[PDB]
Coordinates of all heavy atoms in Angstrom, one line a residue:
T57 N 3.0 -7.6 3.7 CA 3.7 -8.7 4.3 C 4.0 -8.3 5.8 O 4.6 -7.2 6.0 CB 5.1 -9.0 3.6 OG1 5.8 -10.0 4.3 CG2 5.9 -7.7 3.5
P58 N 3.7 -9.1 6.8 CA 3.9 -8.7 8.2 C 5.3 -8.4 8.5 O 5.6 -7.3 9.1 CB 3.3 -9.9 9.0 CG 2.4 -10.6 8.0 CD 3.0 -10.4 6.7
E59 N 6.2 -9.3 8.2 CA 7.6 -9.1 8.6 C 8.2 -7.9 7.9 O 8.8 -7.0 8.6 CB 8.4 -10.4 8.2 CG 8.4 -10.7 6.7 CD 9.1 -12.1 6.5 OE1 9.4 -12.8 7.5 OE2 9.4 -12.4 5.3
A60 N 8.1 -7.7 6.6 CA 8.7 -6.6 5.9 C 7.6 -5.5 5.7 O 7.2 -5.2 4.6 CB 9.2 -7.1 4.5
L61 N 7.2 -5.0 6.9 CA 6.2 -3.9 6.9 C 6.8 -2.5 6.7 O 6.2 -1.7 5.9 CB 5.5 -4.0 8.3 CG 4.3 -3.0 8.4 CD1 3.2 -3.4 7.4 CD2 3.7 -3.1 9.8
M62 N 7.9 -2.2 7.3 CA 8.5 -0.9 7.2 C 9.1 -0.7 5.8 O 9.0 0.3 5.2 CB 9.5 -0.6 8.3 CG 8.9 -0.6 9.7 SD 10.0 0.1 10.9 CE 10.0 1.8 10.4
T63 N 9.9 -1.8 5.4 CA 10.5 -1.8 4.0 C 9.5 -2.0 2.9 O 9.9 -2.2 1.8 CB 11.6 -2.8 4.0 OG1 12.3 -2.6 2.8 CG2 11.1 -4.2 4.1
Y64 N 8.2 -2.1 3.2 CA 7.2 -2.3 2.2 C 7.2 -1.1 1.2 O 7.3 0.1 1.6 CB 5.8 -2.4 2.8 CG 4.7 -2.4 1.8 CD1 4.4 -3.5 1.0 CD2 3.8 -1.3 1.7 CE1 3.4 -3.5 0.1 CE2 2.8 -1.3 0.8 CZ 2.5 -2.4 0.0 OH 1.5 -2.5 -0.8
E65 N 7.1 -1.4 -0.1 CA 7.1 -0.4 -1.1 C 5.7 -0.2 -1.7 O 5.3 -0.9 -2.6 CB 8.1 -0.9 -2.3 CG 9.5 -1.2 -1.8 CD 9.6 -2.5 -1.1 OE1 8.6 -3.2 -0.8 OE2 10.8 -3.0 -0.8
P66 N 5.0 0.8 -1.2 CA 3.7 1.0 -1.7 C 3.7 1.7 -3.1 O 4.5 2.6 -3.3 CB 3.0 2.0 -0.7 CG 4.2 2.7 0.0 CD 5.3 1.7 -0.1
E67 N 2.9 1.3 -4.0 CA 2.9 1.8 -5.3 C 2.3 3.2 -5.3 O 1.5 3.6 -4.4 CB 2.0 0.9 -6.2 CG 0.6 0.8 -5.8 CD -0.2 -0.1 -6.8 OE1 0.4 -0.6 -7.8 OE2 -1.4 -0.3 -6.6
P68 N 2.6 4.1 -6.3 CA 2.1 5.4 -6.3 C 0.5 5.4 -6.4 O -0.1 4.5 -7.0 CB 2.7 6.0 -7.6 CG 3.9 5.2 -7.9 CD 3.6 3.8 -7.4
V69 N -0.1 6.4 -5.7 CA -1.5 6.5 -5.7 C -2.0 7.4 -6.8 O -1.7 8.6 -6.8 CB -2.0 7.0 -4.3 CG1 -3.5 7.1 -4.2 CG2 -1.4 6.1 -3.2
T70 N -2.7 6.9 -7.7 CA -3.2 7.6 -8.9 C -4.7 7.4 -8.9 O -5.3 6.6 -8.1 CB -2.6 7.3 -10.2 OG1 -2.8 5.9 -10.5 CG2 -1.1 7.5 -10.1
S71 N -5.4 8.1 -9.9 CA -6.8 7.9 -10.0 C -7.2 6.5 -10.5 O -8.4 6.1 -10.4 CB -7.4 8.9 -11.1 OG -6.8 8.7 -12.3
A72 N -6.2 5.7 -10.9 CA -6.5 4.3 -11.4 C -6.6 3.3 -10.2 O -7.1 2.2 -10.4 CB -5.5 3.8 -12.4
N73 N -6.1 3.7 -9.0 CA -6.2 2.8 -7.9 C -6.6 3.5 -6.6 O -6.7 2.9 -5.5 CB -4.9 2.1 -7.7 CG -3.7 3.0 -7.3 OD1 -3.9 4.2 -7.2 ND2 -2.5 2.5 -7.3
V74 N -6.9 4.8 -6.6 CA -7.3 5.5 -5.4 C -8.5 4.9 -4.7 O -8.6 5.1 -3.5 CB -7.5 7.0 -5.8 CG1 -8.8 7.2 -6.6 CG2 -7.6 7.9 -4.5
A75 N -9.3 4.2 -5.5 CA -10.5 3.7 -4.9 C -10.3 2.4 -4.0 O -11.1 2.1 -3.2 CB -11.5 3.3 -6.0
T76 N -9.1 1.8 -4.2 CA -8.8 0.6 -3.5 C -7.7 0.8 -2.4 O -7.4 -0.1 -1.7 CB -8.3 -0.5 -4.4 OG1 -7.1 -0.1 -5.1 CG2 -9.4 -0.8 -5.5
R77 N -7.2 2.0 -2.2 CA -6.2 2.3 -1.2 C -6.8 2.3 0.2 O -8.0 2.6 0.4 CB -5.6 3.7 -1.5 CG -4.9 3.8 -2.8 CD -3.9 2.7 -3.1 NE -4.5 1.5 -3.6 CZ -3.8 0.4 -3.8 NH1 -2.5 0.3 -3.6 NH2 -4.4 -0.7 -4.2
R78 N -6.0 1.8 1.1 CA -6.4 1.7 2.5 C -5.2 1.9 3.4 O -4.1 1.6 3.0 CB -7.1 0.4 2.8 CG -8.4 0.2 2.0 CD -9.2 -0.9 2.5 NE -9.8 -0.7 3.9 CZ -10.8 0.1 4.1 NH1 -11.5 0.7 3.1 NH2 -11.2 0.3 5.4
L79 N -5.5 2.5 4.6 CA -4.4 2.7 5.6 C -4.4 1.5 6.6 O -5.4 1.3 7.3 CB -4.6 4.0 6.3 CG -4.5 5.3 5.5 CD1 -5.0 6.5 6.2 CD2 -3.0 5.5 5.1
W80 N -3.3 0.8 6.6 CA -3.1 -0.3 7.5 C -2.4 0.1 8.8 O -1.3 0.7 8.7 CB -2.4 -1.5 6.8 CG -3.2 -2.1 5.7 CD1 -3.1 -1.8 4.4 CD2 -4.1 -3.1 5.8 NE1 -4.0 -2.5 3.7 CE2 -4.6 -3.4 4.5 CE3 -4.6 -3.9 6.9 CZ2 -5.6 -4.3 4.3 CZ3 -5.6 -4.8 6.6 CH2 -6.1 -5.1 5.3

């Protein structure tokens, strides 16, 4: 979400989603 960017809650990075993670 653009407005709530700093308060964004990223989910933990595990082997089940490491392939879809990206740095914005």
Side-chain angles (χ1 to χ4, degrees):
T57 177
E59 60 187 9
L61 185 63
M62 297 194 69
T63 187
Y64 172 73
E65 303 76 353
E67 60 178 2
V69 182
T70 62
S71 63
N73 63 6
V74 68
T76 62
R77 302 303 82 184
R78 299 192 65 78
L79 292 167
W80 291 95

